[PDB]
Design a protein around this nucleic acid. Sequence first.
RNA 1: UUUUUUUUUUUUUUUU
RNA 2: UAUAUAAUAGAAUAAGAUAAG
Lengths: 204, 416, 315, 453, 513
Amino acid sequence: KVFKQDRILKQCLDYLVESNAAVKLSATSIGAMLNSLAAIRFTYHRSVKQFMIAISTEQWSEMDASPLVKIVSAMAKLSLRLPQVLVHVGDRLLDVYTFLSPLDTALVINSLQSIGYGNDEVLMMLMRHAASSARRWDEVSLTLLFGASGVHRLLRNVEVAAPLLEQAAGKTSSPHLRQRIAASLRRSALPRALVQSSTSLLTG
Amino acid sequence: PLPVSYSPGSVTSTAITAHCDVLSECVAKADELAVQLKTQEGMEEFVEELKTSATNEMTALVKQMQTTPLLQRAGMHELRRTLYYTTSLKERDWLEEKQYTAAMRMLTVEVLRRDGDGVLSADDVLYVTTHVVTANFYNRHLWNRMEKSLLKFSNYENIDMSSVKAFSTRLFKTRRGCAKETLDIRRKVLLAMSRRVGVLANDFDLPSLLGVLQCYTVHDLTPFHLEPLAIRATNHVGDFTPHECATLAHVLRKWRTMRLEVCERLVERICTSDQLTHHMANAAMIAIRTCFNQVSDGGRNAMNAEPTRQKLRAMGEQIGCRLDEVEYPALPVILSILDVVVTLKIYVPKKCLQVIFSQANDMVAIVMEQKDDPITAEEGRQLQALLSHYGNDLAPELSQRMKEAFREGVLPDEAS
Amino acid sequence: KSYVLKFLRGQLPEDLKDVNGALGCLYGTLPDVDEFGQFVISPDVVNSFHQFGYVKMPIPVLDHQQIDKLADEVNELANNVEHHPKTERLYATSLADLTGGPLFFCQGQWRAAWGMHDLIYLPTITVAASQILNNSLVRLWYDEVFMKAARTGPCVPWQQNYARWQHTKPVNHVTVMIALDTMNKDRGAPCLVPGSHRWREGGLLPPVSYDPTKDEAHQLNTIWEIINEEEGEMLMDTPPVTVDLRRGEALLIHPLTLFATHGNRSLDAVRCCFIHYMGEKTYAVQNGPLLPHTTKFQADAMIQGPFYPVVFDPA
Amino acid sequence: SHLSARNIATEALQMKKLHQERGGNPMLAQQARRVLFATSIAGQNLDARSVALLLNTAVYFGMESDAKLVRECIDYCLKNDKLITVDVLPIVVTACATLKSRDAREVIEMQAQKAARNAKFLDAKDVTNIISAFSKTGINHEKLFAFLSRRVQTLARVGEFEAAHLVILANAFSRLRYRDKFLFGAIARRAMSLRERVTVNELVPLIVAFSKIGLKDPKLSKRFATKAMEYVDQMNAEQVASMFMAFAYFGIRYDQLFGVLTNRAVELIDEFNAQYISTTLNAFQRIGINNPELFDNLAERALAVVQDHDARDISKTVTALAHFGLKDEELFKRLASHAASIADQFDAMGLVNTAHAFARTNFLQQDMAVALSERSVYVCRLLDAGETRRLLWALAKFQVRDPKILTPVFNRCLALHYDFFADPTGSEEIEEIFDFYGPNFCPPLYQLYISRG
Amino acid sequence: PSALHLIFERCKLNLVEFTAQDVYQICTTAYNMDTLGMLQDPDFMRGLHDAFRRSDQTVISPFQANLIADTFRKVGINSMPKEVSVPEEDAISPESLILVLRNMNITKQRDERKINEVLKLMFPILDEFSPTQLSLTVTELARLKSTNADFVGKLAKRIMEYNDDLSALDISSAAVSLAYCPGISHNILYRMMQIVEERMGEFQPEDYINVLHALNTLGPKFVNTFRKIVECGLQHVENMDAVTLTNYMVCFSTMDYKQREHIDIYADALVEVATDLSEKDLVMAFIALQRLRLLSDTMFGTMASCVIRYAAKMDPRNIAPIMDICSTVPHASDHLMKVLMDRAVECTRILTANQLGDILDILGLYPPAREHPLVQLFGKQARLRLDLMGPDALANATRGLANLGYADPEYYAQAAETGFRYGFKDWTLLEPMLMGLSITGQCPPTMVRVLGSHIAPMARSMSLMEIERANRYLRRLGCEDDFVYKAMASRVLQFVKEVTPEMPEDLQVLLQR
RNA sequence: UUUUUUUUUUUUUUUU
RNA sequence: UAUAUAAUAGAAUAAGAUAAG
């Protein structure tokens, strides 16, 4: 209903935190609640921060891929930056990255960019996995990936950015996204020849 | 016969007078309870009951004014007291926004209608302007017409003393945090009545004399018509309390009337106080500096300039020895006093310097270790230079504290 | 003349009527005296107006950006927290009591607003109005704007324009309605009788009594109360028609046609403009001014002056 | 013409300059108004300079405070107060001078506080522009004026200003009614130190300002009189009338200068317009000099051209002619018939002056009297007791006896009865008024009048 | 399309209750696909804008609101997203004031009172900030051009405290944002540059760009850090982007790098790939190369050839620098110069006073510009712009028009009056006016008197050759005041104390008078 | 041509 | 097995009469 009464949800979250119920809830339930809170731009971030902190490392250790990506996406859309939640997220990603769908990979990459994630190994290996499975990427997934804030940071190697660029040239058909990708290629650290060829393909 | 519709501002009594009498009595009783206090919950109960009674009375008045064409049948004095009570109950928080706006919109409409007729006397204009701008209720046409009608100085020539004093106090009291758009019209109200104040110079009593002078000065207005108003005060020193002489010195300095002869008397009168304070000492030091800067080494009496400075220096020492009794609220007062002493080479005892620097150390022992909360870096440098000039043995703690503060960087810059 | 200060040499006069012609705002400028032939209305439109007492122009008379400008000016006229400058230049306004209401109405706006002043001199509507009045001189009398509330805009009851214009001697008038918004039966489109302009050989029905504390049904149904049996027989065959207007659509209305405006039940305000044009050889009836603070005429003096400017003159 | 907002502000400023000091071409004003009507800065980001220029050019060309561009510019000035530096402060102040909204007042007060705080760090250009801008708003911040006057004196002690700066400074400090004799002495000294660099065009306005400010010192006027006497030959009618007015304002009886000025004025009698004739007659009335040949020449020229007579010109001319005594027959008829046509332009006091001048000379025309009487209902609110008495006596001599016209005048008289009945003069005037209108027309004023107070 | 028509009609009449998210979705599908006539239909877009204005925009991100406003402005509807208020006492969190600042920055509508309010609600709760939140709020405050340096200094100290928790990008962004703040302390800047150079082996090209911008802003007080980065980047010089090479050139020009050994390597690397530069980057590279005295015979040709493809549509603010570079350099640039003159002729309408003055000044002594048709157009435009010219722009324009032989006595007389209104302070601000008048050799005597009264005080600080030129101008104009010649002869006496016939005729004539 | 500047001022007794 | 991401800046510049206390 896009209903915005944040006092009611604040009372509900206070009851959730006080009852120590965040240590027994399911991963998909946590993701659904966080996504619902983020979909309406919840105001009181202190309650959400306490609720996310209260959950234990046991839950973080064996979360499935999709609830985990939902949780990190809801964290990113709520402008939450937590130093100790992100290390748990990173080790869980290290464990279960191979099962991510392409749209999950794009969501993870752009959400981690949106929160200014400082780790580079996890980002680099996620980008490598995305490059390996480039032949299956849809249109919305490419928009989500190449629409990330610091996308040019991730376009480090030619191997990790060649199939993604050719797939974007083949599939993406929006002038603004192509211009943004060309600008990111210009600001990237790729070899000059590949940048020139990709810019030629995308624009013109 | 012509249908004139002019009624004196200060017969033709409608129900508005009966409505306002109840409010007057209720407000008087609610005020008397405050004096009786000097059972807080108990008296708060009576206060709440009186507030509810006044709210009901004002609701009835507003409904009567809206439903019935009472304003046209009303006189002028009742309209003015209705405006007074409508503005006064809001600052006392006995009315809501809706009722207050509904009453004041109709008040302004009726005032504008009477202005269009032309029955607004030279006193009603001042009354409405002062009781509207101080309440900060904005109506474009009313404000513009009042500001335009306050420029006919020929009308405001024979205003009564009591009305002058009432407007002066009303504008003076609520000056502290007034909105900026009100300042210009405040100055216009003050200046429209300036000539009448000038011809009233030989009639004020001394506390009201300083009240009017401070009211004009705080509104950054120093009109020439009020020139005698200050002069009499200069010629009437010795009847003022010691504290008031500091404000008198500041006013005289801002009025280009501070000279050596009056400065001697002002310093002497300050020195008759039982115990000095920061205000009196600061004003005395500033006055001494101002008079010391008024002597020329190549003027008419250039040969006689050297003794005068000496005399002033002596008077400075008179304040210099009584510099421990005061309590400095902020560092700038200490810095100004010390700068005035050093620049004029005034002699200060070591005990006074010790007390001053101890208070300064206790003051700066708040900004750096608490760090929760505005001493700028240049002020700290000036304090360090002063301490070094007078010797670091005075306050050994302060020197190290300032040095570690400057190394740490707690003190911000002036640009920030 | 006198000496104007250097920083005041570009200011416009207090009264905008003092401007002899039209400002450059909105449309560029009035064309040449021999370039007015491209705004002529079709003869079929004239016949339709003479048969029905009303007609809507084939094309919108204003481009969209001009419509946005006019809507912004209407919004600024109805300001309450900061009252409009030149408010005392209006004949009458709904904010004279400073409170307001669901319906905001403003008269004599052309003396206190740019753009609205230029709207008077629009060739597209003035040429058509002149064609309506047997191809003669046209003089602006006055204009007004209505703006309805967001969801509680009231409906104007049935009315005849000439019922209030009793100071003008002959029946020589025309009304132009410009819709600054998109209107509908639920939003404020005008509903008028298809043939009421030729009833009683030109007479006027008595004033209609309405209760301002109820819904729209009785307001629109008072027409039966105010008419007689024969008028009912005429009305039954041709019921009143509500014309839906888009942005910039102009509607020419006879002064004797019965018309009303539906209330606003949309989710935001709706604005409309009425401009009343006389013709030449239109005379007064009684001494004194027709409008508040206007020129005082004689018993049968012809209507002219700066308050009623000439906006189009054939030959 | 599609252009960026900065590229539009630049051409707008150029158009303002050309329409201001290079002839008032109406086409330039219309083009600028059309260009600024469609201009908006809601989305694009601009410097404070561009926004200030747009606001100033919009306000100059007749745009009130209800427009979109003015509202956006005022919102920008209210929000980003720290980006409006001293360089772009006078532009904003001048733009807000005419506007009298609440936001305009707040902006003006904030700029005044900023200028008063930073009054010691400015230069000749900044100080001159700031004082000129604050002259136009009618503000009454005396502390700011004192600070700026002190800075002016210190900056001019080293010979910084020049002719144009001195003219602007004197005009600004005279319009604000700041009778600082030391400041004007410094300005005069800087002017006299500018040998042969103060031309006639830069000398006449200085004398006009020094006359208007009303300085007590009479030694200063002598130097201006001599320098004007040297410069008479190089003058048009404008400056001749200007110095007639100026030396009437000074009030010192000079002889050689007046003779040479009269010679030059009668030389240029074929170039005088309505305003120059009115100014000359008013100056002669103020100074008291009786010059009947020049009065005859001016009356003949005023008879030659009557359409150019504005309400101010008409009022000054009739008042001067009535006070002097000399009066023509057909010239008065033409002036009255013309004032009947433009009776809707008279001010609060100009109307009273014109009506009383026509009544005092026993010249009664029905059309003019009716027009002035009917117009005398929107101006009674803005009348002092003396002006109200004059208007009431003019109406009594005109025999109006119309309640709709009389009751506002009597309301004003009752609302100002103390200043009305205690006037040192006019007792016979009030006696004649009450003899005409009788006791029963207005009871309360009669009861007050038979009480002498 | 009966259903589509009904939906459009119901949207037009404002009878559909729209949420902010629904309006955002409609805007996205209209801007992306636009298969239907959504953007082309004005009434539907007006209705959608009316729904969006009255909606509740708190439930959308600042980016979404910005996109909605951009979509509305693309069609003509002047739209502007609502301003968000400062959070209340309960919602005062480190993650909400940052959101306020971010929305203020993104929507491009900054209120300084709101900035102060959110800077006074951040100090008590400044201990709850994450290490990345400080690096975010520093850049957000820098992008708002805030003048509060104490708050940024405290933030920088905290950022230094959490050094190990921040990535290279955060450190570089904090460094450049700190460098952009004007009033910040210098000890903090030194500490930040030490931190940057300690963690400098992990930098991406973006971090290199940020560090170079920070160094260029700071100036030649930070030479050691620039030397360190130059020594480190020498390995990557061949495999390097063009923009960062241009920034290296700009920093080299700014710091006055005396080690001219690596400058050659970096300049050659830049000129190799100069083909991939835009307008501003190419202009900056030109200026940096000129100020480093690097324009050789061949690299100038390549850079000019690169400029040729851009000279047709150059901005009016990028024409004068290239003209100056061509003027100073002694190589062949006739074709580029002609193209630039044609572009200036095209742009003469929109050129401001300063740009027109610079263009006229550069072409003052250019031989081919004598017969080019720009002289008359620029003279007329300068006469029009003479009201807006400053004390120096007027002098530059007058000098350029006098050197070109443009003869119009009215323009020079108006320039004389404008100069008299402004006043003169240097001889270089008065000589162009004198030669412009001497071109026609006629002016009213009052003009001569004012010019002589201006010249006379200035005669005590002129060289002998300038005295000769001033005497020539005064003789051509026809002055007769004696004190001016007295002062000129007094100044001449000092340089040549001998009245011997050795000096030329003009000198004897001057001392005689 | 030699007069002047640099505070947190808060104390006016009306029934409007 | 899900309905969706959005941030790069450049310009130094002065017009001038209100029927007062």
